[PDB]
Structures are given as structure tokens and as C-alpha cells.
């Protein structure tokens, strides 16, 4: 647990890349398509990808991204606190 960086000493970008966005959407779409509970008010949609986008819009995806520094340490960022451009 020595690798983990304290929240105050986080020196990575506070925006989320396109790769992280695509990975998160894919994971959430798979979990929804495997009958996982939905955290938002579904309105007439039957596609897991669109419901994943909808959950992302209200920032309700309960996932955490771990970013690997080259030496081996890592930095943990919640999906709620990552700024997504539109």
C-alpha cells in the first residue's frame, strides 16, 4: 500500500481522456446487459449503451479509475470527480 499517493499530492490531469471514457462506457454497458441494477430513471430506452451514457450524464457511475505511473505507483480518481468535456 506504499504505492498509493495521498489525495492531496495528486499531480495528474483532472480531465478524463477519451480512452478512459470509452473503457468506462464499455464496462457499464456490459454490466447493464448482464442484468445489473440501473441507478437512473430509465425512460423508454432498451439499449445498454444509451443507458450507460444517461448514467454518465448525471455522474452516477460508481467506478474508480486507477492510473499507473511509470515507476509503479498509482493514483485513484473517482468517475464522479472527473471532468468530461461535451
Amino acid at each position: 500500500k506504499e504505492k498509493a499517493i495521498p489525495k492531496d499530492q495528486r499531480a495528474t490531469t483532472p480531465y478524463m481522456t477519451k480512452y478512459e471514457r470509452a473503457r468506462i462506457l464499455g464496462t457499464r454497458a456490459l454490466q447493464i446487459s448482464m442484468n445489473a441494477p440501473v441507478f437512473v430513471d430509465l425512460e423508454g430506452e432498451t439499449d445498454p449503451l444509451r443507458i450507460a451514457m444517461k448514467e454518465l450524464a448525471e455522474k452516477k457511475i460508481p467506478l474508480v479509475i486507477r492510473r499507473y505511473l511509470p515507476d509503479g505507483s498509482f493514483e485513484d480518481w473517482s468517475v464522479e470527480e472527473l471532468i468530461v468535456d461535451l
Binding site: A11, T12, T13, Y15, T17, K18, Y19, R67, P70, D85
Partner: protein, 257 residues
């Protein structure tokens, strides 16, 4: 920028950390031109009749004249512009002005003029203090590297040097009040839009830049064969260039033709 073993190839990608598709050709206006044109364009003086602001441009033009703090700020700005001219002429010894850079400031200013229906026939409600402080703060709010020790600070200033030079070149006080005639609302809008469009041009970690660079270099190499022999049209210029020259550069041949 590193490799599979962890060896650093570049301490920053591209030396400024910018994506290759967020970069357009823009002209640095400080380099070229004679000293008289530079002095007329960028110098403003509140005590000499030669270089005063016409009071019909600034809403508070009558009262500001003769002040002391304002001329000190303008003098600092002009010293900065002079140092920028010296540095830019040190870098590009050829004197060329058009280089690729992020953010098209001209289009942002044109959009501000078109959206707010700015009428040039009326005085503007801007303040010299506000213009200078706003430009300096916007420079303070441009970030590519977010370290905390002095090394990262130096690296980040080195990265953003040239863009700060262009930004100072376009947003000079006389240019704002006399050439654009922006109001306070349009000025705030321009500053916010510039910061937002800059922050979206940084390169995304995870990008495989090696294969991108290799493909970029070696795609025109395929078409290079056709026009290699144009120098073959000059018999007395039998100098290797084209496919064989690139081959010799890559092989690091010890016996050139």
C-alpha cells in the same frame, strides 16, 4: 515520452505537450515590421501629445489623461513587448512570422464581434486596469504540467512561452480599444473562450505516438518516389536526394555518394 524499458526519449512530447490536430498556422506580429510601425502600433502614452488615446474611444477617456499608475502599467507592458521582440528575433533568425500554434484567436475575436453586435461608432466601457490584469491572469491560468517543485514550474513556463508571446501580441491595449472596439462583456467572453479552447488541446495520456510518427513520416515516403527525379532534370546537379538519400540517412552510411 518513454519506451518499453522506461528510458525517456523526450521529457515532453513535442516540447510543448500539444496534440497534433489542435494546431493551426498563426502569425506573430511582433517579429516583422520597422521600429516606427511597431512604436505606432503598440505604444500608448498618457503624457505626450504624440501617443495619446483619442477620448472618443474610451468612455472614461477624459479623466484618465494625466494619471500616473496607468502610465507605469503601460510602460511595463511596452517593456515586455520589447523583450518579446528581442527574444523572437533571437529564435527565428530568418525573420519569418507564420508558425503553427494552438487556438485561433482571430476567429474568437471575430465571433465576439459578430455575436454581440458591437457598434464601433460608440465609446467602450473598458478599463486599462481591467485589460492588463485580465490578460495577465489568463496567462496565469494556462496549464500543461501540474507539479509543485520548481523543476515542473520551469518546465511549464518553458512550454507555454511562445503561446504567451502570441497572446500578448494580439491583446494589446491599443489594439483592443482601437482595432476591435470590444466592450466588457465581449472581453470577458473572449478570455473565457480562449482559456477553454486551450485547455482542450493538451495530448491525452495513453496515446501511441511512436506508430503515429512512423506512419506520418513513411506515408509520404511512398509517394516520394515519383518526384525524386525532378532533380534528375538538372544534369549538372547530380546530387543524391529522394529515396536513396533517405536510405543513406537511415542506414547511417559511412560512404556517401
Amino acid at each position: 515520452t518513454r519506451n518499453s524499458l522506461g528510458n525517456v526519449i523526450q521529457f515532453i512530447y513535442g516540447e510543448d505537450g500539444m496534440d497534433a490536430a489542435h494546431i493551426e498556422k498563426q502569425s506573430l506580429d511582433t517579429i516583422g515590421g520597422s521600429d516606427a510601425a511597431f512604436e505606432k502600433r503598440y505604444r500608448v502614452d498618457l503624457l505626450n501629445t504624440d501617443h495619446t488615446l483619442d477620448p472618443s474611444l474610451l468612455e472614461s477617456g477624459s479623466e484618465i489623461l494625466g494619471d500616473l499608475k496607468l502610465q507605469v502599467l503601460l510602460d511595463e507592458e511596452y517593456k515586455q513587448l520589447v523583450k518579446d521582440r528581442k527574444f523572437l528575433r533571437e529564435v527565428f533568425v530568418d525573420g519569418e512570422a507564420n508558425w503553427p500554434l494552438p487556438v485561433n484567436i482571430r476567429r474568437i475575436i471575430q465571433n465576439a464581434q459578430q455575436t454581440f453586435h458591437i457598434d464601433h461608432t460608440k465609446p467602450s466601457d473598458l478599463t486599462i486596469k481591467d485589460i492588463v490584469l485580465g490578460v495577465k491572469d489568463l496567462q496565469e491560468n494556462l496549464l500543461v504540467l501540474r507539479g509543485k517543485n520548481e523543476i515542473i514550474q520551469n518546465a511549464q513556463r518553458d512550454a507555454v512561452t511562445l503561446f504567451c508571446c502570441l497572446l500578448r501580441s494580439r491583446l494589446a491595449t491599443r489594439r483592443v480599444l482601437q482595432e476591435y472596439r470590444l466592450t466588457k462583456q465581449a472581453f470577458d467572453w473572449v478570455l473565457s473562450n480562449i482559456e477553454a479552447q486551450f485547455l482542450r488541446s493538451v495530448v491525452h495520456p495513453g496515446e501511441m505516438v511512436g506508430v503515429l510518427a512512423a506512419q506520418s513520416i513513411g506515408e509520404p515516403a511512398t509517394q516520394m518516389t515519383l518526384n525524386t527525379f525532378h532533380f534528375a532534370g538538372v544534369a549538372s546537379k547530380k546530387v543524391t536526394s529522394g529515396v536513396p538519400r533517405l536510405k543513406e540517412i537511415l542506414n547511417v552510411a559511412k560512404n556517401m555518394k
